Design an enzyme around this catalytic site. Structure first.
Site, PDB file in Angstrom:
ATOM      1  N   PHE A 239      -7.466 -35.195 -38.125  1.00 31.90           N
ATOM      2  CA  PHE A 239      -6.941 -33.871 -38.434  1.00 31.90           C
ATOM      3  C   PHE A 239      -7.854 -32.779 -37.896  1.00 31.90           C
ATOM      4  O   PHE A 239      -9.073 -32.831 -38.070  1.00 31.90           O
ATOM      5  CB  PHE A 239      -6.779 -33.691 -39.946  1.00 31.90           C
ATOM      6  CG  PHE A 239      -5.600 -34.426 -40.530  1.00 31.90           C
ATOM      7  CD1 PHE A 239      -4.354 -33.811 -40.618  1.00 31.90           C
ATOM      8  CD2 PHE A 239      -5.762 -35.695 -41.080  1.00 31.90           C
ATOM      9  CE1 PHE A 239      -3.282 -34.447 -41.259  1.00 31.90           C
ATOM     10  CE2 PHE A 239      -4.696 -36.335 -41.721  1.00 31.90           C
ATOM     11  CZ  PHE A 239      -3.458 -35.707 -41.811  1.00 31.90           C
TER      12      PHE A 239
ATOM     13  N   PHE B  87       1.534 -35.858 -35.091  1.00 30.13           N
ATOM     14  CA  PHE B  87       2.642 -36.101 -36.024  1.00 30.13           C
ATOM     15  C   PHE B  87       3.028 -34.902 -36.902  1.00 30.13           C
ATOM     16  O   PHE B  87       4.146 -34.839 -37.408  1.00 30.13           O
ATOM     17  CB  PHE B  87       2.365 -37.340 -36.905  1.00 30.13           C
ATOM     18  CG  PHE B  87       1.082 -37.269 -37.702  1.00 30.13           C
ATOM     19  CD1 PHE B  87       0.998 -36.490 -38.852  1.00 30.13           C
ATOM     20  CD2 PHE B  87      -0.021 -38.035 -37.336  1.00 30.13           C
ATOM     21  CE1 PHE B  87      -0.164 -36.474 -39.623  1.00 30.13           C
ATOM     22  CE2 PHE B  87      -1.184 -38.033 -38.100  1.00 30.13           C
ATOM     23  CZ  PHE B  87      -1.257 -37.250 -39.246  1.00 30.13           C
ATOM     24  N   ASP B  88       2.121 -33.939 -37.059  1.00 25.62           N
ATOM     25  CA  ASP B  88       2.389 -32.760 -37.888  1.00 25.62           C
ATOM     26  C   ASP B  88       1.408 -31.641 -37.579  1.00 25.62           C
ATOM     27  O   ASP B  88       0.225 -31.891 -37.381  1.00 25.62           O
ATOM     28  CB  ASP B  88       2.276 -33.126 -39.374  1.00 25.62           C
ATOM     29  CG  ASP B  88       2.863 -32.059 -40.304  1.00 25.62           C
ATOM     30  OD1 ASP B  88       3.507 -31.094 -39.835  1.00 25.62           O
ATOM     31  OD2 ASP B  88       2.718 -32.219 -41.531  1.00 25.62           O
TER      32      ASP B  88
ATOM     33  N   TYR C 243      -3.657 -26.867 -40.176  1.00 27.77           N
ATOM     34  CA  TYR C 243      -3.944 -28.215 -39.697  1.00 27.77           C
ATOM     35  C   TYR C 243      -3.008 -28.692 -38.595  1.00 27.77           C
ATOM     36  O   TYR C 243      -1.863 -28.250 -38.494  1.00 27.77           O
ATOM     37  CB  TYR C 243      -3.926 -29.222 -40.854  1.00 27.77           C
ATOM     38  CG  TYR C 243      -2.542 -29.572 -41.353  1.00 27.77           C
ATOM     39  CD1 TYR C 243      -1.805 -30.612 -40.775  1.00 27.77           C
ATOM     40  CD2 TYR C 243      -1.934 -28.816 -42.350  1.00 27.77           C
ATOM     41  CE1 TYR C 243      -0.498 -30.872 -41.171  1.00 27.77           C
ATOM     42  CE2 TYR C 243      -0.630 -29.070 -42.753  1.00 27.77           C
ATOM     43  CZ  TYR C 243       0.081 -30.091 -42.159  1.00 27.77           C
ATOM     44  OH  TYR C 243       1.380 -30.302 -42.548  1.00 27.77           O
TER      45      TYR C 243
HETATM   46  C1  RAD Z   1       8.093 -31.659 -44.376  1.00 30.10           C
HETATM   47  C2  RAD Z   1       7.606 -32.953 -44.968  1.00 30.10           C
HETATM   48  O1  RAD Z   1       6.275 -32.623 -45.173  1.00 30.10           O
HETATM   49  C3  RAD Z   1       5.557 -33.208 -46.195  1.00 30.10           C
HETATM   50  C4  RAD Z   1       4.122 -33.500 -45.754  1.00 30.10           C
HETATM   51  C5  RAD Z   1       3.949 -34.436 -44.561  1.00 30.10           C
HETATM   52  C6  RAD Z   1       4.418 -35.851 -44.920  1.00 30.10           C
HETATM   53  C7  RAD Z   1       3.863 -36.944 -44.012  1.00 30.10           C
HETATM   54  C8  RAD Z   1       2.418 -36.715 -43.554  1.00 30.10           C
HETATM   55  C9  RAD Z   1       2.117 -37.604 -42.351  1.00 30.10           C
HETATM   56  C10 RAD Z   1       2.207 -35.227 -43.195  1.00 30.10           C
HETATM   57  O2  RAD Z   1       2.959 -34.906 -42.016  1.00 30.10           O
HETATM   58  O3  RAD Z   1       2.588 -34.427 -44.288  1.00 30.10           O
HETATM   59  C11 RAD Z   1       0.718 -34.937 -42.998  1.00 30.10           C
HETATM   60  O4  RAD Z   1       0.323 -34.339 -41.991  1.00 30.10           O
HETATM   61  C12 RAD Z   1      -0.215 -35.310 -43.968  1.00 30.10           C
HETATM   62  O5  RAD Z   1      -0.557 -36.489 -43.919  1.00 30.10           O
HETATM   63  N1  RAD Z   1      -0.739 -34.467 -44.875  1.00 30.10           N
HETATM   64  C13 RAD Z   1      -0.077 -33.204 -45.180  1.00 30.10           C
HETATM   65  C14 RAD Z   1      -1.150 -32.141 -45.122  1.00 30.10           C
HETATM   66  C15 RAD Z   1      -2.259 -32.465 -46.091  1.00 30.10           C
HETATM   67  C16 RAD Z   1      -2.818 -33.847 -45.810  1.00 30.10           C
HETATM   68  C17 RAD Z   1      -1.777 -34.968 -45.790  1.00 30.10           C
HETATM   69  C18 RAD Z   1      -1.276 -35.308 -47.193  1.00 30.10           C
HETATM   70  O6  RAD Z   1      -2.082 -35.522 -48.099  1.00 30.10           O
HETATM   71  O7  RAD Z   1       0.124 -35.434 -47.505  1.00 30.10           O
HETATM   72  C19 RAD Z   1       0.631 -35.759 -48.765  1.00 30.10           C
HETATM   73  C20 RAD Z   1       1.012 -37.257 -48.736  1.00 30.10           C
HETATM   74  C21 RAD Z   1       2.243 -37.480 -47.867  1.00 30.10           C
HETATM   75  C22 RAD Z   1       1.281 -37.758 -50.153  1.00 30.10           C
HETATM   76  C23 RAD Z   1       0.215 -37.493 -51.216  1.00 30.10           C
HETATM   77  C24 RAD Z   1      -1.080 -38.238 -50.906  1.00 30.10           C
HETATM   78  C25 RAD Z   1      -2.073 -38.208 -52.048  1.00 30.10           C
HETATM   79  C26 RAD Z   1      -1.533 -38.777 -53.364  1.00 30.10           C
HETATM   80  O8  RAD Z   1      -2.519 -38.536 -54.375  1.00 30.10           O
HETATM   81  C27 RAD Z   1      -0.179 -38.112 -53.770  1.00 30.10           C
HETATM   82  O9  RAD Z   1       0.478 -38.965 -54.653  1.00 30.10           O
HETATM   83  C28 RAD Z   1       1.659 -38.520 -55.249  1.00 30.10           C
HETATM   84  C29 RAD Z   1       0.765 -37.957 -52.567  1.00 30.10           C
HETATM   85  C30 RAD Z   1       1.860 -34.897 -49.068  1.00 30.10           C
HETATM   86  C31 RAD Z   1       1.492 -33.499 -49.530  1.00 30.10           C
HETATM   87  O10 RAD Z   1       0.465 -32.959 -49.119  1.00 30.10           O
HETATM   88  C32 RAD Z   1       2.419 -32.778 -50.510  1.00 30.10           C
HETATM   89  C33 RAD Z   1       2.308 -31.272 -50.344  1.00 30.10           C
HETATM   90  C34 RAD Z   1       2.034 -33.148 -51.923  1.00 30.10           C
HETATM   91  C35 RAD Z   1       2.644 -34.096 -52.628  1.00 30.10           C
HETATM   92  C36 RAD Z   1       3.891 -34.820 -52.182  1.00 30.10           C
HETATM   93  C37 RAD Z   1       2.207 -34.591 -53.993  1.00 30.10           C
HETATM   94  O11 RAD Z   1       0.886 -34.092 -54.221  1.00 30.10           O
HETATM   95  C38 RAD Z   1       3.127 -34.184 -55.163  1.00 30.10           C
HETATM   96  O12 RAD Z   1       2.744 -34.871 -56.309  1.00 30.10           O
HETATM   97  C39 RAD Z   1       3.761 -35.406 -57.075  1.00 30.10           C
HETATM   98  C40 RAD Z   1       2.939 -32.712 -55.511  1.00 30.10           C
HETATM   99  O13 RAD Z   1       2.213 -32.378 -56.438  1.00 30.10           O
HETATM  100  C41 RAD Z   1       3.721 -31.673 -54.734  1.00 30.10           C
HETATM  101  C42 RAD Z   1       2.933 -30.379 -54.647  1.00 30.10           C
HETATM  102  C43 RAD Z   1       5.072 -31.438 -55.412  1.00 30.10           C
HETATM  103  C44 RAD Z   1       6.221 -30.994 -54.507  1.00 30.10           C
HETATM  104  C45 RAD Z   1       7.550 -31.116 -55.230  1.00 30.10           C
HETATM  105  C46 RAD Z   1       6.284 -31.841 -53.261  1.00 30.10           C
HETATM  106  C47 RAD Z   1       6.364 -31.305 -52.066  1.00 30.10           C
HETATM  107  C48 RAD Z   1       6.416 -32.119 -50.859  1.00 30.10           C
HETATM  108  C49 RAD Z   1       5.810 -31.736 -49.750  1.00 30.10           C
HETATM  109  C50 RAD Z   1       5.874 -32.581 -48.561  1.00 30.10           C
HETATM  110  C51 RAD Z   1       5.497 -32.225 -47.345  1.00 30.10           C
HETATM  111  C52 RAD Z   1       4.939 -30.853 -46.929  1.00 30.10           C
END
Ligand code: RAD
Lengths: 107, 94
Positions: free
Chosen positions: A99, A36-37, A26
């Protein structure tokens, strides 16, 4: 909701099921084209399990209707993305997101 | 209580990312993460804590540093750099 515009066609039959892991490339940008990413800038694909609320709703519904190989343009309303709050410092309030996402394979 | 570092960091990171990304709670994010970094500071006492430390120790310490930099700078970019490293270790723990 989310609009899905096809850039390059997928096989038209292999779609993702809930609980399957979707592997994508993506590039995300604000509606004016400001990036932005991008996973392509990192050379490594993005994985998430479908239908688990790991990602924003627009991705969940948009990617669900893509088939393997397909590159599509997801135009996502603020409602299906980050809403009125947005994401502080990164995504502004009430932002429509765009996206470019290619569904590489299903696991 | 007794807990494997493997398990401690798994549930810890899940909690922290929920609070930051899901709820916009950066203060709460610091609450859950700081204890886990403190545990690492006293050092490994078993074979399983030693191997975890050898594999993931540098990455976690670097991530703590990016959190530390955020604290002084206000630059949200520094927090994302911390979470890039946290995500990396998480998906290897799984
Ligand atoms: C390097 C920084 O990069 C960030 C992602 C960046 C942040 C800011 C965003 C502009 C962006 O640039 O992504 C971006 O392009 C974008 O909007 N995305 C990411 C690509 C998929 C679509 C979208 C998104 O949904 O992001 C989401 C969005 C930010 C928050 C989501 C949104 C939906 C909600 O239902 C959920 O609520 C909780 C949170 C972030 C993610 O895709 C990450 C992977 C997943 C989560 C954090 C949660 O699901 C969490 O739940 C507890 C998990 O189960 C994860 C697996 C556990 C582990 C420990 C966490 C890992 C963290 C990973 C973080 C990253 C790679």
């Amino acid at each position: 909701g989310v609009q899905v515009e096809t850039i390059s066609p997928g096989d038209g039959r292999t779609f993702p099921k809930r609980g399957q892991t979707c592997v994508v490339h993506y590039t995300g940008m604000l509606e004016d084209g400001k990036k932005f990413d991008s996973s392509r800038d990192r050379n490594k694909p993005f994985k998430f399990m479908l239908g688990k609320q790991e990602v924003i709703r627009g991705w969940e519904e948009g990617v669900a209707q893509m088939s393997v190989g397909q590159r599509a343009k997801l135009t996502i309303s603020p409602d299906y993305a980050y809403g009125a709050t947005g994401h502080p410092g990164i995504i502004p309030p009430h932002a429509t997101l765009v996206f470019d996402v290619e569904l590489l394979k299903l696991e | 209580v007794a807990i494997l570092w493997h398990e401690m960091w798994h549930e810890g990171l899940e909690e922290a990312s929920r609070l930051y990304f899901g709820e916009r709670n950066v203060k709460g994010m610091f609450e859950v993460l700081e204890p886990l970094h403190a545990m690492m500071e006293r050092g490994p006492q078993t074979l399983k804590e030693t191997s975890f430390n050898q594999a993931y120790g540098r990455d976690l310490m670097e991530a703590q540093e990016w959190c530390r930099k955020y604290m002084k700078s206000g630059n949200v970019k520094d927090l994302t750099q911390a979470w890039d490293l946290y995500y990396h270790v998480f998906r290897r723990i799984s």
